[PDB]
Symmetry: C11
Subunit: 167 residues, 11 copies
Amino acid sequence: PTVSHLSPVHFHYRTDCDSSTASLCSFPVANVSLARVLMYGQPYRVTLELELPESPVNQDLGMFLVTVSCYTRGGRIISTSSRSVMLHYRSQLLQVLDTLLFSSLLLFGFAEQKQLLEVELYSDYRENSYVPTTGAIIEIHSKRIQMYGAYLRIHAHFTGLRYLLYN
Amino acid sequence: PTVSHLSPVHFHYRTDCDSSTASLCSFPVANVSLARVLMYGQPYRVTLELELPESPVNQDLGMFLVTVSCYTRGGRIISTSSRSVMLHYRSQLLQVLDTLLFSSLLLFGFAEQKQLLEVELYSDYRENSYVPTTGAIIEIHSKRIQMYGAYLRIHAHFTGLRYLLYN
Amino acid sequence: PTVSHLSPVHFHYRTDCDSSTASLCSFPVANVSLARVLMYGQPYRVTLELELPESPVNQDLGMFLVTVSCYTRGGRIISTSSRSVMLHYRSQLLQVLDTLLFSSLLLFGFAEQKQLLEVELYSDYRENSYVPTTGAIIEIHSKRIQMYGAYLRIHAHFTGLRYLLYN
Amino acid sequence: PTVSHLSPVHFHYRTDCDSSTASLCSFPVANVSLARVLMYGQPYRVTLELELPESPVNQDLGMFLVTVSCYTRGGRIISTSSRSVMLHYRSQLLQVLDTLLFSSLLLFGFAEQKQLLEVELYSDYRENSYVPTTGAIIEIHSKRIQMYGAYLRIHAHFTGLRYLLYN
Amino acid sequence: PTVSHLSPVHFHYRTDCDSSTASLCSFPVANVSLARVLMYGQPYRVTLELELPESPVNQDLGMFLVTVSCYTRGGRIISTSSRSVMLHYRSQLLQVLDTLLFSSLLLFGFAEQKQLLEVELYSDYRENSYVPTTGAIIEIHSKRIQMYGAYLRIHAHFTGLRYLLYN
Amino acid sequence: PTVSHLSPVHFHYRTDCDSSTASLCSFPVANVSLARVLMYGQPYRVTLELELPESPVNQDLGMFLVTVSCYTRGGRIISTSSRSVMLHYRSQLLQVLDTLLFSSLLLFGFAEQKQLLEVELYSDYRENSYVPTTGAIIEIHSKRIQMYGAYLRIHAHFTGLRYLLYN
Amino acid sequence: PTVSHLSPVHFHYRTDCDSSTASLCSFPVANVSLARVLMYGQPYRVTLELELPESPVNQDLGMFLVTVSCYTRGGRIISTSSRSVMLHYRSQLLQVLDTLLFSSLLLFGFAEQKQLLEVELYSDYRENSYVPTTGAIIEIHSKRIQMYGAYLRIHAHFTGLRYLLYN
Amino acid sequence: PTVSHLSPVHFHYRTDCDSSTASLCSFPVANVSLARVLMYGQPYRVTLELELPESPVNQDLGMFLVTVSCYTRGGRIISTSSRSVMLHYRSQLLQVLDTLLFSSLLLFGFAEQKQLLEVELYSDYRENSYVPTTGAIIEIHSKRIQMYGAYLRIHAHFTGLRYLLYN
Amino acid sequence: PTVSHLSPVHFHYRTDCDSSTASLCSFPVANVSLARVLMYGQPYRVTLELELPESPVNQDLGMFLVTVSCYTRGGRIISTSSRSVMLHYRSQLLQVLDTLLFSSLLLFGFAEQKQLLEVELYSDYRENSYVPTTGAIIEIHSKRIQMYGAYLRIHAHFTGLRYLLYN
Amino acid sequence: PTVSHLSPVHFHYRTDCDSSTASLCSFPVANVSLARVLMYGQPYRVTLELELPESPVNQDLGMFLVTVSCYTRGGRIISTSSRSVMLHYRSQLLQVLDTLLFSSLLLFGFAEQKQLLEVELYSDYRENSYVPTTGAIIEIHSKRIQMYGAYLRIHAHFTGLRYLLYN
Amino acid sequence: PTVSHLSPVHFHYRTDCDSSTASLCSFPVANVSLARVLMYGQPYRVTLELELPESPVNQDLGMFLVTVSCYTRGGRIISTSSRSVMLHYRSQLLQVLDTLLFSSLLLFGFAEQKQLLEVELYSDYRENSYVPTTGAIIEIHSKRIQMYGAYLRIHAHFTGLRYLLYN
């Protein structure tokens, strides 16, 4: 075991526009409930492992800002952060080679044509005694992103040489 | 056996517009009657397994919101939930490979070019003594979705070692 | 033998508009006379097996609503029902494989490129002592549905072990 | 021999319009003289076997309505009927396969690329003592149909096991 | 020999229009002089064998009406008749196969790419004592019908067993 | 020798328009001097053998009317006649097969890609004692015909079985 | 030797327009000096052998009129004549075969892709005692005729057995 | 180890425009905090290693300007610099060869289709006694630069024989 | 040697227009100084050998008039002449065969894709005692010609059988 | 060692236009500090070796003027110069052959698809005792040039036979 | 050695306009200093060897004018000349063959795809005692000429047998 918890992010968005294309109405957003893993003074790592398929719409998407806004039990925004993430580029021939050689896994469902993007919104987050962390608002500032789901993973920074096992 | 009840969902919608395109008129909606499997205190898992073909119109559909609205015998809404689901991406070469190597099943009807999307609208649902669950309203906020049918599956969350049989 | 009667449906529709396209003029509707297979209390299964060719126009058709309206000898409407049906998708590579390997049946007329859609408008139908069933109106809310014919098949729900004869 | 009479239908139509395309000016119609094969009480089968070539124009035609209107010696219309008919769909690969294998008949004139469509406008037509059947008006509500000719075939419904000989 | 006379039809038409296209200016028409083969009481078969090349312009022509108008020495119209005739369809692969296999005849002029259409305007024609048949007006209601020539062939209806000589 | 004379026709036409395309100003026409081959009472055959290349412009030409107008020494018109003619259709594959197998003649000039059309404007032309035949006016009612030349040929109709030698 | 003289024709034309196209400005024309070969009473043959390339511009040219206008030393026009000539049609496959097989002459300059068109303006020309022939005006009524040069050729009509030297 | 510190840059930008294109709303900008490695007198090399994928959007980008703006703890700007950088060009054939031969690394994630651009904004930087370096603002003056991340790498200019460890 | 002199022509022309295409401002012209080859009474041959490349712009050029205007030392124009010249046509297949088989000369510069056009402006030019020939003005009436240079080659006409040596 | 110094040029330019294409706001420019290599009286060679990739945008660039402006310590301009330079042309086949036969160097980074253009702005530059050279301004008058960097290289002109070592 | 001097030409031109195309802004010009090689009375050959790449833009350039304007020490213009020059045409097949066979030199830089054009502005130039030659102005009247450089070359016309050293 390890000192960590996963809070999957359930993005929702508005749907009242024309919607005559593959473009959503409003920017995806979400609340998350963090209600210990956090301890006073200790820095913690907060990331949003985000699951993007390699569908053609996503390749043409380009960069898009991602922001996280932590807050307290009373809703007060403790801190704000932002990072830019982009689906990694792979050439069309490379994709075909990847699809071919990994056919034995993709066909049986052991592998899938998706990318996990590790947007590290915090390399060192520390608990405040007078201001407790209770939940997070997470956003993906783009109306054309296609995604399956996202996890807000927290873990104590102290890992040592054992970090190599996560490769 | 399993302590569960499958309430198949029959989506209906309006049809009075011009309708000169594959796009429909109004947002698909449904009303399902849940009338025990539910018991007080016990958490329950509510999911809508959605049967989408891999037709080209669906691959270009993009993300689309799905919402479930539970309510009582008197119509009062107990709780409201929403999730976003999308048909999984598969490259054209992969599809040609899937269509070929699984031809022996598709041709004889043992397999079909369709995806079951497990929209989990409630990972832990529990019954209220003063507010009984009687029915649900289920929506798919898109005028371009093509679907065959949907089951609202409720199952007691206790799995334990029994997962080996459900895998 | 089986306790059933087949009431083939003969759709008719208006023809006075411009009609300069494969799209018809008005919504296909039909009337069918049910004049006993029905008995008080016993549940009955009412379905409309719909014969759709796999012609290209039908594959781009998309979903379309099919509604049934039962009524009495006096014309009073007993109940109203609706189910959405869609022609099953088959990739272009799959169709060519079907056309090829099943050529020996397609050419000699033993097989044809058509689909039967089992639109089950009623899984539990029962006769009412004060309201006798006499006939039904059946509709297919689409101006582009190419079809050959349809049967409204009623059958006693008691199957039990007898399903093996139907399998 | 059989108790039947064939009354070939000679469709004629107006031609004063622009006629700048392959679309006729007015709806095909016809009069036919049925002047016994009909006898009182017995129901009879009336069909219009319609000879449509498989030319590309006809495949894109889509559905079209065919109506038969019987009438007496005095011109009074006895009954009106309508059945929708469509040319059966065959894929381009299948047609090429049919053309290749059946070349030995198509080239020498023993076979032709045409479909006989059996519009059964009456499965049970009964003669009336006070109203004799004299003639019929037959229509094909489409300006884009291409056809060679049509027979209105009548025959006593009493066939029994002998019907298999018509296969 | 046989009791018959062939009166070749010389279709002529006006030409003072714009004529900037393959379409003619006015409807083809013709007079033909029949002045015996016709005798009182005996039925006669009157047909117009029409020589249409299988050119692309003719295949896209579609159906076209053909009318015949008999008349007396004084010009009085005896009877009027009309039929619809269409060039028989043949697929491009079939046409190529015919051109290839029957090349030996086409190249040396023994065969030609033309269809004889037997527009049978009268299956039973008889002479009237007080009204003699003198000549006929014939028409082809189309501005796009490419043709080489036409024979109006009359013949005694009595064939009987003699059809074997014509088979 | 034979009782015949040839009067080659020299068509001339106006040239004052824009002429920005392959379309001539006015309908080709001509005068021909017929001044014996003609004898009183005897009917004679008059034809115009017309030399048309198989150039693409001519294949798209379609039907065109050709008229002949005989006249006397004083210019008085004796008779008028008209026959429709059209270059015979030959498929592209047939032409390629012709160009190939007959290359040995076309290349060395012994054969040419031209068609002779025998417009038999008169199957029986009779000389009149009171009206002598002196000259002919000939026409081809089309502004798009491409032609090399034309012979007007007259010959006594008395041929008998010797006609086969002209094959 | 032969009783003949060649008077090469040198066409000239105007050049004042925009000339933004391969089409020329004005109709080609030319004078020629015939100043004996001509003798009184004797018929003579006057022809213009016209050297046209087989360039694409010429094949789309179509027919074009050619006229010759003889005149006297005083300029008085003795006689007027006109003929219509056209470059002979050769298919694209034939031209390629001509280019290939006759390469050995075309490449070394012994052959060239050109046609000599023998526009015979006079089959029988005779000299008049009171009116001497001095020169001729020659025209080619087209603005799109690409040509290298032209000879006007005269020769005594008497050929007889001497044609063997010209065949 | 070496006398150096890395200060990764986290660019953020506005997201309120239409954003219906791969172009971003505003110029990428960033703020980086440097709070020693810097010492008085000693020259230092400040560079921004920038991680650009080889995606087609970036190849068409063309030259873009990158600027750095150092400043103190109080915000006072110490020095301003600017260098223009561009992604290196590689032909489509070269890219395919790179993708092919280096497939064994790209597929397993050991290699990726990205370029590190060493924008050396300062070859000789030295600390000021009265003005301390605290942080730097960095920019990329282009709305279309797709990038993963960047490091502001500082290192003592003293290399000498130690370059062998960096080669 | 021979009694001749070559007076190379240097064409110069205006250049002040927009010149946004491959078309020149004004008609090429030039003066040439002829200052004995000429002798009184004797007719002489004057030609302009014109060096046109076979570039596509020249093949589509079509005909173009070329004129020479001789004049005296006083500028007085002695005589005026004109001829029409055109680059000889060579099919694309012929050019490819030429470029191939003559590659050994083209590559080494011994042969070049150019045509010398011998525009013979005077087959017999006679010197006048009272009017001496001094210089010439030579023109090429086209704004789209591409040329390298030109020689005005004069030579005594008396050649006899020796003319064959010039081949 | 050699009597020379290299002063790399760092072009900077404005960036506040629309910038919707691969074009820049203003002409590239730069200052450079030349602060001995220069000596009085001796003329010196000054050049700008310019590193241009062979990317397609640069090939379509065409010529572009380059200017150098020397100046003194006080900023006074000593001399001005300009030379036009252009990236060398290499055919598509040649580039592919180079990309292929030199793959072993391009892939490993030993070679790159770039061209060094040696714009020699001064073959003899002499130092003035009363006017010292201190710095230079260098420009590239094009908004579409793509370049990596430029060196302004100075070297004493006294080379002799040793110049061959620079090959 | 030889009595000659090469005065390389450095073309400069304006750059103020939009310049959004490969076409330059103003006519290329130059000024060259000629400051013995020239001696009184002796003829001299003055030429401009112009280095043009075979780039596609230059092939479509077409003919253009080049002029040289000599002048004295005081600027007085001594003589003006103009010769029209054009890049030599080479078919695409010839270029491909040239690129292939001469690849070994092009790849190593021993050969280049460029043409040296010798514009012989003067074949006989002589010095005037009262008017000395000091410099020249050279122009290339085209805004689309892509060029590398140009030498103005003078040489004593006396070659005689010495041409063998230059062949």
